[PDB]
Amino acid sequence: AKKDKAQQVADVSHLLSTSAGFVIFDYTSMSAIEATSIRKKLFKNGSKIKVIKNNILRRALKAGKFEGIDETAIKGKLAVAVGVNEIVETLKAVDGVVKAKEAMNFVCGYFDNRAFNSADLEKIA
Amino acid sequence: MLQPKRTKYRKPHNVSYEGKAKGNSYVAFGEYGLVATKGNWIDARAIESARIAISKCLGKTGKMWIRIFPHMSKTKKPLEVRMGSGKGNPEFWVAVVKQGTVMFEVANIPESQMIKALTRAGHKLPVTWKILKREE
Amino acid sequence: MKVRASVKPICKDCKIIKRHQIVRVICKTQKHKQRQG
Amino acid sequence: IAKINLLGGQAKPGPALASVGINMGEFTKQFNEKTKDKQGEMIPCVITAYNDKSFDFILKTTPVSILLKQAAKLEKGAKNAKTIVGKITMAKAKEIAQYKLVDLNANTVEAALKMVLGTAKQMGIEVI
RNA sequence: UACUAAGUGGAAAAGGAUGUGAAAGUGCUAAAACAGCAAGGAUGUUGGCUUAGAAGCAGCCAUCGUUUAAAGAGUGCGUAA
Numbered sequence A: 001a002k003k004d005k006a007q008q009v010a011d012v013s014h015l016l017s018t019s020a021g022f023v024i025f026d027y028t029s030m031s032a033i034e035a036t037s038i039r040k041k042l043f044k045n046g047s048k049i050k051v052i053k054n055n056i057l058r059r060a061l062k063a064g065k066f067e068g069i070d071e072t073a074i075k076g077k078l079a080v081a082v083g084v085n086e087i088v089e090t091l092k093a094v095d096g097v098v099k100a101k102e103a104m105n106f107v108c109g110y111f112d113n114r115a116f117n118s119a120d121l122e123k124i125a
Numbered sequence B: 001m002l003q004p005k006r007t008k009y010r011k012p013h014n015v016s017y018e019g020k021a022k023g024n025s026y027v028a029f030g031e032y033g034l035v036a037t038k039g040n041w042i043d044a045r046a047i048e049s050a051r052i053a054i055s056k057c058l059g060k061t062g063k064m065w066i067r068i069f070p071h072m073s074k075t076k077k078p079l080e081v082r083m084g085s086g087k088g089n090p091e092f093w094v095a096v097v098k099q100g101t102v103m104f105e106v107a108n109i110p111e112s113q114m115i116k117a118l119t120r121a122g123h124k125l126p127v128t129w130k131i132l133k134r135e136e
Numbered sequence C: 001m002k003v004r005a006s007v008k009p010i011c012k013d014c015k016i017i018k019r020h021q022i023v024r025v026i027c028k029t030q031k032h033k034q035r036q037g
Numbered sequence D: 001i002a003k004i005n006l007l008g009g010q011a012k013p014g015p016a017l018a019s020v021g022i023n024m025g026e027f028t029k030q031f032n033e034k035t036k037d038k039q040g041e042m043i044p045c046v047i048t049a050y051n052d053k054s055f056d057f058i059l060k061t062t063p064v065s066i067l068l069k070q071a072a073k074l075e076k077g078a079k080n081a082k083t084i085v086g087k088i089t090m091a092k093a094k095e096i097a098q099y100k101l102v103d104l105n106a107n108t109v110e111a112a113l114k115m116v117l118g119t120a121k122q123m124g125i126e127v128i
Numbered sequence E: 001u002a003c004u005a006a007g008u009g010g011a012a013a014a015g016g017a018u019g020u021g022a023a024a025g026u027g028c029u030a031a032a033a034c035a036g037c038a039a040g041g042a043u044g045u046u047g048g049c050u051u052a053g054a055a056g057c058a059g060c061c062a063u064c065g066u067u068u069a070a071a072g073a074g075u076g077c078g079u080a081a
């Protein structure tokens, strides 16, 4: 209901407030076996892949007093890859896997109170 | 074939099925029931067809009750016989179903099987049937 | 095509339509075409 | 991609492979080379069947619930779920879990613990 | 002032139907509804008896659990399986 939605938006906003790194991905053509493989290869509590609602992510972003991420969350399929402490190794790991995949897109994310572009994601690894 | 073991009188006057519902009007043993919407004479043969249908479409733990019983008999003069020379001999037993009498009831199995079971029982009977539930 | 006084879907794919003021049942399986509903 | 059932000690036959173009005679030595540590046990193999021709294969553990029978000291489990015959403690369950951790896609070891209970419930063995 | 689209009116039953109008409730929805489209749609494993064989889809012993957004001892087709 509305109360559950309010609780959900509050806790994800808190999680993204206390976090340090974020990157957005799509869910096009990768297997669930592969999904479990990514979970085990990360194996770090700081690194977390999650399916978030597009609407809930924008509203939690609004509550996070950040800006510029709107272009990422518009008419697109969104993943969240939150990283605590070190985020470069998580980005390196996910980049190696998408190279191991068949096809994949990659949308701009958010880290260190700054935003990046697609090519900036290519070099952030 | 439900049949009374003995009767005091072999040839009674027929019992009318026109009127409202005297007894057997509300589900009181199960909780789903097959109500009638048209009074008619239905014989023990139709009961056995309907009862066998319910039992075949029942499960391993469902339980059923048959309310109506063919108390009254009916006669039929032999073919090619001119009128007179007394009443005919009893041929078949019929239960008197009035508009509003619950004939069959079922319980102790999920709702869909019970709805289906009552449907197949009512397609075996001439009266226009309807599903009803038991008051809490 | 099967002509019956009563027509009902046989599978979950059977779909009831009303064509030329007659109700029929069409489906992927041609054994299940019904008419005269 | 083909999940084929091949004996560890006898894997040279199998005509199905020849339909895809796999070099059967060269790869028989690869099939037999890395299964000598588990001789006698039946071991299926997953094959990344493709036109690359460099078919990478992965072995696989014998199927579960036979070590449950071995640990329960009974040949065949009960024919009724309600009827309880075999009893298995946590130590035998954990040995089975660490053995079968290789084929399982679970992240943690307690997840593997309660897999043994789950298949033991299917076998009817009480978890004590 | 409404209704019918059947020449019903201007003859008929058991039964069947997204014909249409009225009413009374209940679920979701611009924190996105339903349909469709684009993706995934899992692991132990193909569980085990059982069956020549079944191991996602023969009867069973039942009708498992994790990862996870989701996934069913599967939805069918289908494969000796």
Ligand SMILES: [Mg+2]
Pocket (backbone or CB within 6 Å): E010
């Ligand atoms: Mg007329």
Ligand SMILES: [Mg+2]
Pocket (backbone or CB within 6 Å): E017
């Ligand atoms: Mg209708």
Ligand SMILES: [Mg+2]
Pocket (backbone or CB within 6 Å): none
């Ligand atoms: Mg209406």
Ligand SMILES: [Zn+2]
Pocket (backbone or CB within 6 Å): C010, C011, C013, C014, C027, C028, C029, C032
């Ligand atoms: Zn059909």
